[PDB]
């Protein structure tokens, strides 16, 4: 797993990692209406998926393989899209705080911190955009904000339990549109 | 004060921040043989030098202003070229580690850590290349590797520490890495 840090894959004024852009655009072109996108295990193992993530047109690949490589990408990032410091703070507030809008405002504040490269917020924004576009064809792909949140929150925060429930809902709301 | 983090100013495959490249290339074009480069102050204050670090061709400026803007840039980076995490560990090393080669090995390992974006090490390498290029015209600019280390180590590490055998070691490694490029 040689995948560089998000901050090493691109920098402003670019808006997202170029590899993540290729994956998202190919997946959206080929699987926007696939009733099982992101919920089916393809036949490829991590080593094969990583070969795809190390270099040519991703549209040539099976859409279920692209979906698995997307997940592999989020898993292999040296640091998760939502850094551990941010997740740790949100989780330790879990019993004391229960306002979703407060969690959302705090997540935004924490992830835009000066100590955290801007690329993390930018990538999160790009992923939320992708997840939201999928939810607009939910009647066909069955991926609504809630399902998308349950699938990807563990990859974005990098957790496998009851504390997590607050994090999942945050993503669900942010997918559906919010601050 | 508004200078973005090194990790936000560029990313691979670029090798250094574009602004730093402009400064270095202009300084090398106009001052490679200047015998007081980096050793005299220009008349501009920090606010004016920061003004320059936004926006034109930098070759248009007085070379002594460019040299001061170069220093201003290193000082205004939100985190120094050599992050404090690295400096703290290096300064903490015991006297039994008397080997410059060991300090260098640890600097590379610590600064290449996944917790530190590759841009910091890349920027340091670009600066060392510049410092090495200067030391090769020492017969005219009077700049050797050691003096360049003594001048710029406080800007690269940005570390208030009392002079010790640890501080001497960090200056020494920078000296070695300049002459080794």
């Amino acid at each position: 797993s040689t995948l560089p840090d998000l901050a090493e894959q691109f920098a402003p004024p670019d808006v997202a990692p170029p590899l993540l852009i290729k994956l998202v655009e190919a997946i959206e072109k080929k699987g926007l209406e696939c009733s099982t996108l992101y919920r089916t295990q393809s036949s490829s193992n991590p080593a094969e998926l990583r070969q795809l993530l190390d270099c040519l047109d991703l549209e040539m690949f099976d859409v279920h393989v692209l979906a698995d490589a997307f997940k592999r990408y989020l898993l292999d990032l040296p640091n998760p899209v939502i850094p551990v410091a941010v997740s740790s703070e949100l989780i330790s507030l879990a019993p004391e705080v229960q306002s979703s809008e407060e969690y959302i405002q705090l997540l935004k504040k924490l992830i835009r911190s000066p100590s955290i490269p801007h690329q993390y917020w930018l990538t999160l924004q790009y992923l939320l955009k992708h997840f939201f576009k999928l939810s607009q064809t939910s009647s066909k792909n069955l991926l609504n904000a809630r399902v998308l949140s349950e699938l990807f929150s563990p990859l974005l925060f990098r957790f496998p339990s009851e504390n997590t429930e607050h994090l999942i809902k945050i993503i669900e709301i942010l997918i559906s549109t919010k601050w």
Side-chain angles (χ1 to χ4, degrees), chain A residues 1-54 57-160 163-164 166-176:
Chain A
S1 179
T2 59
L3 198 52
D5 198 279
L6 280 176
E8 296 167 3
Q9 292 183 35
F10 78 107
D14 293 331
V15 304
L19 176 59
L20 183 60
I21 288 170
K22 290 186 195 163
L23 283 162
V24 164
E25 292 186 346
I27 291 166
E28 289 185 358
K29 188 178 192 197
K30 299 184 71 175
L32 186 64
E33 287 172 9
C34 173
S35 276
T36 61
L37 184 76
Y38 288 133
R39 296 182 299 172
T40 78
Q41 184 71 54
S42 91
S43 63
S44 307
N45 63 22
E48 294 169 69
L49 295 173
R50 287 170 184 145
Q51 281 293 356
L52 181 159
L53 304 169
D54 293 317
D57 180 11
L58 292 184
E59 277 173 31
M60 299 175 68
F61 291 90
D62 195 299
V63 71
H64 295 293
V65 173
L66 293 173
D68 284 1
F70 181 86
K71 289 178 183 178
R72 188 76 261 153
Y73 174 95
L74 299 173
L75 289 166
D76 288 355
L77 290 173
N79 302 292
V81 173
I82 301 174
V84 171
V86 178
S87 62
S88 290
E89 176 162 325
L90 297 171
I91 286 169
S92 76
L93 293 176
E96 295 84 356
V97 176
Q98 304 245 323
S99 171
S100 297
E101 186 196 314
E102 167 130 30
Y103 277 116
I104 289 170
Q105 171 186 26
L106 182 61
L107 170 58
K108 178 172 167 183
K109 180 176 184 177
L110 290 172
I111 201 170
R112 291 186 91 121
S113 157
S115 60
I116 300 171
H118 195 37
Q119 288 89 327
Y120 286 80
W121 169 249
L122 287 169
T123 303
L124 181 56
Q125 284 280 80
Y126 188 75
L127 291 164
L128 293 173
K129 172 196 200 70
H130 171 60
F131 296 154
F132 171 80
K133 173 147 194 175
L134 293 171
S135 74
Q136 292 183 296
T137 58
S138 55
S139 58
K140 295 181 174 61
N141 62 36
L142 306 184
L143 296 171
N144 56 41
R146 174 65 203 182
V147 168
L148 286 165
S149 184
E150 283 161 354
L151 284 168
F152 288 108
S153 286
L155 299 184
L156 299 171
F157 293 101
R158 184 165 298 176
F159 61 70
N163 290 297
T164 75
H166 273 97
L167 303 189
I168 297 166
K169 182 78 173 44
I170 299 179
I171 299 307
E172 171 184 356
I173 292 162
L174 287 170
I175 290 164
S176 322

